[PDB]
Design an enzyme around this catalytic site. Structure first.
Site, short mmCIF file in Angstrom:
data_model
loop_
_atom_site.label_atom_id
_atom_site.label_comp_id
_atom_site.label_asym_id
_atom_site.label_seq_id
_atom_site.Cartn_x
_atom_site.Cartn_y
_atom_site.Cartn_z
N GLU A 147 0.82 -1.23 0.00
CA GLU A 147 0.00 0.00 0.00
C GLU A 147 0.85 1.28 0.00
O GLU A 147 0.29 2.39 -0.19
CB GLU A 147 -0.97 -0.01 1.22
N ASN A 149 -0.25 -8.26 -3.71
CA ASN A 149 -0.82 -7.42 -4.79
C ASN A 149 0.20 -6.46 -5.43
O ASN A 149 1.13 -6.03 -4.70
CB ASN A 149 -2.02 -6.57 -4.31
N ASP A 176 -7.26 -5.55 -5.51
CA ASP A 176 -6.50 -5.82 -4.27
C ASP A 176 -6.74 -7.24 -3.75
O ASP A 176 -6.98 -7.43 -2.53
CB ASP A 176 -6.75 -4.75 -3.17
O1 LIG Z 1 0.19 -5.33 1.01
C1 LIG Z 1 0.77 -5.47 2.07
O2 LIG Z 1 1.96 -5.48 2.25
C2 LIG Z 1 -0.23 -5.75 3.22
C3 LIG Z 1 0.24 -5.97 4.63
C4 LIG Z 1 -0.84 -6.26 5.61
C5 LIG Z 1 -0.15 -6.58 6.95
O3 LIG Z 1 1.15 -6.49 7.04
O4 LIG Z 1 -0.87 -6.86 8.09
C6 LIG Z 1 -2.21 -6.43 5.31
C7 LIG Z 1 -2.49 -6.06 3.89
N1 LIG Z 1 -1.62 -5.89 2.91
C8 LIG Z 1 -3.90 -6.37 3.22
O5 LIG Z 1 -4.03 -6.33 1.83
C9 LIG Z 1 -4.94 -6.97 4.10
O6 LIG Z 1 -6.11 -7.27 3.61
C10 LIG Z 1 -4.69 -7.10 5.50
C11 LIG Z 1 -5.57 -7.51 6.59
C12 LIG Z 1 -4.80 -7.53 7.75
C13 LIG Z 1 -5.09 -8.15 9.17
O7 LIG Z 1 -4.24 -8.34 9.94
O8 LIG Z 1 -6.44 -8.19 9.33
N2 LIG Z 1 -3.45 -7.20 7.35
C14 LIG Z 1 -3.40 -6.86 6.00
CA LIG Z 2 -2.33 -5.19 0.74
#
Ligand SMILES: O=C(O)c1cc(C(=O)O)c2c(n1)C(=O)C(=O)c1cc(C(=O)O)[nH]c1-2
Ligand SMILES: [Ca+2]
Ligand SMILES: O=C(O)c1cc(C(=O)O)c2c(n1)C(=O)C(=O)c1cc(C(=O)O)[nH]c1-2
Ligand SMILES: [Ca+2]
Lengths: 72, 596, 595, 72
Positions: free
Chosen positions: B177, B261, B303
């Protein structure tokens, strides 16, 4: 664009109706700054050099030190 | 690691994330069973001292429990005969600016263990949000080594659990992100020296491909595509971070995992298939070299980050032949089954019949057949797309029963509206570029904002679901299964629950202090079976409650979808431990008291 | 209030702080008893969403539980047939600067209830750390009225629970460590109008005295002493805040309570007896006029703040006459019993034989006999004084069994070293002026820093202790007793415990998530008996852990005494509810699910 | 000073050996600023006047208003 027209192995992308094959020069051009694109690879090179100095001092002396300013 | 394999065979222990190298979350214990589960009640509890989301599960080895927390990432060791005494604690000092570059709450998915050799003592392995990795003495808690993996000044953080294989520890990455280009790293577990590092995009030298990469399925793609499926230098900020789970087969020497992604979320800014984001990999444990790579979602528009759980099994295929397999439920709405020795596709079925982004997956060409009416693009507002960006499956660790040949999966029922927008890249700032609206899918109650989850039992060769049950909220934290004919799981509204493995009937539940976002675990101690789970709501579903947000497009669109969660739970942080009739270490209440 | 008296007679309710107007914390229920308590186990739980200390206990009225928190002082209502649904919540907006003028953690001691009159609906009454008082609709949670009692800009905060008598609500005061002059206030419970206000120091008009104040005991003192026992205008910043508990007798129409310490802690800066700080009061509920006042600690030298619990009873004295009584265990190491109709002194005995600050209390003159070797003064370091400033008793609410005639008391075992220093007064800034070192008393382990608590059973007329037991840490949160022959209490190391009422034998314990600093409560619902307690460590003993402190003289000296507490517990916030075999509202697991 | 010598009922204080009966003019004089001593009574008068405006408007209108600038 339905994903099923493939000009080579693993290469099936097409532009959607009314969109161009290349975005440079178009109203979608991102115009990225090369000096900003290169910052995360220069940061990794510097972490890797600081980690080598920590690991070689541990293997000579037998005692771990994280703070690079205190290593000979 | 040969001694980790041996240790995982004892029911007194739980030694790694996912229980064993097959990653099945399955116990042979049957003291607790469908005939007596109504008698299950709490035996003891422990608060961590922190709020925010509590992900993963504890470890148990040699009569001790090891506990981890949300930011600033503390570690505790407890003795099972007297858990009121804390044996040791590690409390890191970190820069508070690490909080400002986390996308999705201050979470961490857990610890790993290395059993020691002949001069180095046994070790606990941990990650920190600020990007450091550390090894701690398992008996005393003192630091043995600490190294820098990720840099918060360019938006790069850590939330994944470490994984131990032979005498190495494997470390992932977070920050797509914020335009971070993904990589994974192997370190020497005794010293912290870097052995190998592999990137998800860019020139072949950086990708670490074997000389026979994809030789059995060359139609998946081979050399040159990490730059050839991008325009110019856009791959340099291109995503593909790996923040989910791993599995391992000693017989192939491969680790199995998925990449995330591409960046930004605005698809119009990055024409091309964007390889090797969204890919199922098999990589050699000793050199890092990829033997195979299957891209599930070419040119992502939604995503659908490709990081979810990997579960191994051995079953006969539709022609009667014995196969070694991996099974993987993705964000995009498809559950994938592949041959784990060469990468061949066996099955690819929908998680629910309401999936509309694809018509089907073609098993002979390997491509998903897209429905253009549910795609995304500039200058257009797309409506009623299933799944949403949260997925029909996210980071929960599921389970497999090898006697029954069934997978028990915790599922999401959430759909969306989406429009992208143009923006610059600045190192250290967010790089997203889309606005979203999210809500219950067609089988829930869209007008009341309830009916956002499901739990299902699945056979991967026939594709048939033995049973299916609706839930108030998304089942976000995974599942655990046992030889007692039971399936256990935690919920966001604040319960531990148990269902019959053959029919799905609800047999038992208990009201724990806060919603659960990690998996249950189980172990024996001096003859008594225990079941443990974390409490403490958070992660993506909890951002509105955790940060006091009210605009429904805030939280990357999760705030509107989970608007009713605060009517059922508040924040917390700790562990609850259960047994039959609540039998435990203080049944003689004089144990552990002060005496003169 | 006559309707509150009637509601308290049902075992399905718990309607006020301390259960009933006698303040005995005693239940006639015997479903849970000494013969079956091994079967007690959790039935359901609830997290509050906050850290820091969780004091007091919940209320139960008409099938609902009412829960309160640490700063910023949230309120929740739960239905007992389905406690997973939150019926309503109140979340106040407050200036974050209130946190900086709190002496002793961000705590609050709980809620009160008024049953309605057919025009105004039934109400929940609450305090806030920033000094506001509010009335909430009990069915919906909406604010009916809100007024300013205390000002944070001069160091003045609120932590005390409100108290309802007739159609009035009584509100106390905090801030003697910042030089605040104490006062208590009565408001009309329907509108917020101020009816009466009484101060702890100053001219007689501000004290609100009856025309016959202390006519039965004139040797206690009468007119002019709120200025005559001070030099010049030092009474204006003189302390005496009231932040503990009350009792009430409809037959005398008096409320009973204690006033706190004089300011500053440096005794040399305030010569004189410093009246009416450190005093047991009886005041009329409708006009506030004082009938009697007994000063326990003239000229304080030790921070022995006089605010602790009041417990009423009716017993024969040593000459065999029936007496109506109050009983009160103080910070200073003495437990006091007085006649509650006229103020006369009946008994005054030591909490433990290791007390050395006084030789005795003279029952004929009422004065404590001081030992000058254990006093404080400028230019001198005083050593080994017992009790410490934390007391041999602090803010915990204790219990009384009327058939056994026994009080069950949670006690501290902590001693100290002390030296004062000169400093100026500036409104809004701290005004302490002493440096302390604190450690276990002679019956604990002074080099491992463990053995800091006791629990005891006591008769107020004979003075005999039936039984006495040591504890790892101070017993800070109080006790609750029942007709099943059990005494329940929470501990700082994280347990709910039960002991036998006649012998003190430990019969049962459970490991709750964090240490307890409030009292246990009990009720029936559809025929089943439940026991409930808060978890979440804090208050004065927890400041080292809550604020990450390491210098032993920090936290007013509490950081050194409690240095081992972090080896047994971490912070938390919530409620745990117990029953026999863990029977509860989800025995049919389909209740409360989505469909 | 042992607390038992009283020159009037409720008034038993005595100075310790070597200390004065009055501290004004001595090396222990606190030297308090009269304007700082008077600040908390001025604050109580301002709170009581704002509360009276809130309570009288509630009784006359039946609607509670906390912000006194909105009360005519
Ligand atoms: O793209 C990334 O590097 C990244 C990292 C994280 C993360 O490190 O917890 C999440 C997301 N994306 C993401 O797309 C996502 O749906 C998400 C949900 C959560 C969680 O702990 O509920 N972390 C993340
Ligand atoms: Ca993500
Ligand atoms: O002098 C005062 O006004 C005042 C206020 C408070 C409070 O409001 O909690 C405490 C104290 N004093 C204090 O002397 C004290 O020992 C104390 C302990 C605690 C606690 O909650 O554990 N509060 C307070
Ligand atoms: Ca005080």
């Amino acid at each position: 664009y339905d994903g099923t027209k493939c000009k080579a192995a693993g290469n099936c992308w097409e532009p959607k109706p009314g969109f161009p094959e290349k975005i440079a020069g178009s109203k979608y051009d991102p115009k990225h700054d090369p000096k900003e694109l290169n910052k995360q690879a220069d940061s990794i090179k510097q972490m890797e050099e600081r980690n080598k100095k920590r690991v070689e001092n541990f293997k000579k002396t037998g005692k771990f030190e994280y703070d690079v300013a205190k290593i000979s | 690691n040969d001694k980790l394999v041996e240790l995982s065979k004892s029911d007194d222990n739980w030694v790694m994330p996912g229980k064993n190298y097959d990653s099945n979350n399955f116990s042979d214990l049957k003291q607790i069973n469908k005939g007596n589960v109504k008698q299950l009640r709490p035996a003891w509890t422990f608060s961590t001292g922190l709020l925010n989301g509590h992900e993963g599960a504890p470890l148990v080895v040699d009569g001790k429990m090891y506990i981890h927390t949300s930011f600033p990432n503390n570690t505790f060791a407890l003795g099972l005969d007297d858990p009121g005494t804390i044996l040791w604690q590690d409390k890191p000092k970190q820069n508070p600016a690490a909080r400002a570059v986390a996308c999705c709450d201050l979470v961490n998915r857990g610890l790993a263990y290395w059993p020691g050799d002949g001069k180095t003592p046994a070790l606990i392995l941990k990650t920190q949000l600020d990007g450091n990795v550390a090894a701690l003495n398992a008996e005393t808690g003192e630091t043995v080594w600490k190294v820098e993996n990720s840099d918060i000044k360019v938006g790069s953080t850590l939330t994944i659990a470490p994984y131990v294989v032979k005498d190495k520890v494997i470390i992932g990455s977070s920050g797509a992100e914020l335009g971070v280009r993904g990589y994974l790293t192997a370190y020497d577990v005794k010293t912290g020296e870097q052995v190998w590092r592999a990137y998800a995009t860019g020139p072949d030298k950086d990708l670490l491909l074997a000389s026979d990469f994809n030789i059995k399925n060359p139609h998946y793609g081979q050399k040159g595509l990490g730059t050839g499926t991008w325009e110019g230098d856009a791959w340099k900020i291109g995503g593909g971070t790996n923040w989910g789970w791993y599995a391992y087969d000693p017989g192939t020497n491969l680790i199995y995992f998925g990449t995330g992604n591409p960046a930004p979320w605005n698809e119009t800014m990055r024409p091309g298939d964007n390889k090797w984001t969204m890919t199922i990999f098999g990589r050699d444990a000793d050199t890092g070299e990829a033997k195979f790579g299957y891209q599930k979602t070419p040119h992502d528009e939604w995503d659908y980050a490709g990081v979810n759980v990997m579960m191994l099994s051995e079953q006969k295929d539709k022609d009667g032949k014995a196969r070694k397999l991996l099974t993987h439920p993705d964000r995009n709405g498809i559950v994938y089954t592949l041959d784990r020795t060469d990468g061949a596709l066996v099955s690819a079925n929908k998680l629910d019949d309401t999936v509309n982004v694809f018509k089907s997956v073609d098993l002979k060409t390997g491509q998903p057949v897209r429905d253009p009416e549910y795609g995304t693009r500039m200058d257009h507002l797309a409506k009623d797309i299933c799944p949403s960006a949260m997925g029909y499956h996210n980071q929960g660790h599921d389970s497999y029963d090898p006697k029954r040949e069934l997978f028990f999966m915790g599922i999401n029922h959430i759909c969306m509206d989406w429009e992208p927008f143009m923006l610059p890249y600045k190192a250290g700032q967010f790089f997203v570029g889309a606005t979203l609206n999210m809500y219950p899918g067609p089988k829930g109650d869209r007008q009341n904002y309830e009916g956002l989850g499901q739990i299902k039992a699945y056979n991967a060769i026939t594709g048939d679901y033995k049973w299916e049950k609706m839930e108030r909220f998304a089942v976000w934290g995974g599942t655990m299964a046992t030889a007692g004919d039971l399936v256990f799981y935690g919920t966001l509204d604040g319960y531990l629950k148990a269902r019959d493995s053959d029919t799905g009937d609800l047999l038992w539940k208990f009201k724990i202090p806060s919603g659960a976002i990690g998996y249950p675990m189980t172990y024996t101690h001096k003859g008594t079976q225990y079941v443990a789970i974390y409490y403490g709501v958070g992660g993506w579903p909890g951002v509105g409650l955790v940060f006091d947000l009210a605009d429904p497009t805030a939280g990357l669109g999760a705030v509107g979808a989970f608007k009713k969660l605060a009517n059922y739970t508040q924040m917390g942080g700790g562990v609850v431990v259960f047994s039959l009739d609540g039998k435990g270490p203080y049944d003689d209440p004089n144990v552990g008291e002060w005496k003169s």
